[PDB]
Amino acid sequence: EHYKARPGIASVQKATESAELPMKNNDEGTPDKRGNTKGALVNEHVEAR
């Protein structure tokens, strides 16, 4: 083990582990198995704020 990594493998890989993460799901507004639209009851613009 003569050569050590100049940016550092343990530093680059720990950021690539969270670049690997997929996009968070957005579920509200869509119906469930019964038929009810899931999510909270709120004004849409108040929710977007």
Partner 1 sequence: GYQCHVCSAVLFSPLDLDAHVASHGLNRKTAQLLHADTPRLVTWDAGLCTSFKIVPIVPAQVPQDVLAYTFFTSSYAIQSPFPEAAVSRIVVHTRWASNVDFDRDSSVIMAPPTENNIHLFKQLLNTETLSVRGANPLMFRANVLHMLLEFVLDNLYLNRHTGFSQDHTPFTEGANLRSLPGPDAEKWYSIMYPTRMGTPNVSKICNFVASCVRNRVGRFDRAQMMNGAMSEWVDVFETSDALTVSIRGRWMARLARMNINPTEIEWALTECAQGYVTVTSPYAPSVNRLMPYRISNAERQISQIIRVMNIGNNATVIQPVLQDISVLLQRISPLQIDPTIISNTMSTVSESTTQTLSPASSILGKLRPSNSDFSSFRVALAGWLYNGVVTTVIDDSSYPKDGGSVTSLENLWDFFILALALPLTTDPCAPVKAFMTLANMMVGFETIPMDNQIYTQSRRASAFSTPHTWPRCFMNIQLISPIDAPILRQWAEIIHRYWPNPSQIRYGTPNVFGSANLFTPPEVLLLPIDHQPANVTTPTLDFTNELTNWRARVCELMKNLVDNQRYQPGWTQSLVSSMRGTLGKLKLIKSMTPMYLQQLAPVELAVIAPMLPFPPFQVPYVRLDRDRVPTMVGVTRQSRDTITQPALSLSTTNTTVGVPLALDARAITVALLSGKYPPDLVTNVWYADAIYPMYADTEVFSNLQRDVITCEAVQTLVTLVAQISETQYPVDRYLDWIPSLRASAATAATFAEWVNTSMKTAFDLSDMLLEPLLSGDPRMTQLAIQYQQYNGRTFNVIPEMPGSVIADCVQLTAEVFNHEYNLFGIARGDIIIGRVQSTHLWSPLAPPPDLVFDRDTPGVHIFGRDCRISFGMNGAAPMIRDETGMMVPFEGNWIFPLALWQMNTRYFNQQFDAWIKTGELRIRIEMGAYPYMLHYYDPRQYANAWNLTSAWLEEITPTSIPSVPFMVPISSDHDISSAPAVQYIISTEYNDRSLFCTNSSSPQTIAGPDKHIPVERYNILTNPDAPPTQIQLPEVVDLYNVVTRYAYETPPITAVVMGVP
Q: How far apart are CA 43 and CA 23, in angstroms?
A: 25
29 sits near partner 1 (criterion: CB under 8 A): no
How many binding residues for partner 1 (CB under 8 A)? 19
33 sits near partner 1 (criterion: CB under 8 A): no
27 sits near partner 1 (criterion: CB under 8 A): no
45 sits near partner 1 (criterion: CB under 8 A): no
Work out the end-to-end distance of the chain between its first and last CA atoms, rounded to an integer number of angstroms.
Answer: 53
Q: How far apart are CA 49 and CA 20, in angstroms?
A: 28
Residues found near partner 1 in the complex (CB under 8 A):
2-7, 9, 11-13, 15-23
